[PDB]
Amino acid sequence: SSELFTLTYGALVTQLCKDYENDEDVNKQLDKMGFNIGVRLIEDFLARSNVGRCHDFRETADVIAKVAFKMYLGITPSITNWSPAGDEFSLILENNPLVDFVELPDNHSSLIYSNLLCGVLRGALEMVQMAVEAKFVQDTLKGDGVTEIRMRFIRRIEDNL
């Protein structure tokens, strides 16, 4: 099982904390890595699903929460907190999906433990021509009641220039 992935992710985070000595730099590297991963993962996801285009950001949200999360992490976040415009939504998860534990005392206040998921989400959606911002606004590992990834549609990526 992918106790493997969480253990591997955890070792990566730990290693980055050793290398950087700045949690914001760990966060950026994680995001950067996630993006790189998401770009490749969307290819895998589209081939493994027979998921077509999403004619909306609501439809995009359903795929991400119901199909994509289920495929890769074996879970299904709920979609909450729609903006009236329909351009932002939250993904709610019961726990931090990439990470079980946190060492005490907390010497990594700024660290966004699963920020890789946010890179992943943004890279993947870039490849289906949606500029997005994904960010954790709640995390159980920060003592919040749930983990919340807020997704925000920025723009459709122009064909050509």
Partner: protein
Amino acid sequence: ADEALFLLLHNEMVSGVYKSAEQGEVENGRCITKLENMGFRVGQGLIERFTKDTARFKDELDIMKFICKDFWTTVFKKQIDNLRTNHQGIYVLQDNKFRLLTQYLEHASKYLAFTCGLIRGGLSNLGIKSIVTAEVSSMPACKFQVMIQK
């Protein structure tokens, strides 16, 4: 988590964060060690997780047998294809189709370094200090050499 995710993380760590810009041996060495060390931690944690029967190996050959069958199966969903030993501390673990050489491959030995650590950390938690190295013997295979420390 689907193995797709692990394979992509592994590939991303090797080709991204910890690819050497080939500045020199020191940079190459450091990049290599970071991957191997990570593997070492993961190896430790896989043992903790799936092997609290640390009592029931009771000697080196059983431990290398476990690595070859159960441990490799945990990580790569199959066993190694050949275990050879000199009976003097060296073991060679052959994987004929090594799964992490699938993401051509110039820097392919970088893709072995995490797994060398996996084995080393796995043995560390089973009581054995080792140096673990690897090479691609004939792509897509792949021998890992485990030298056990006195």
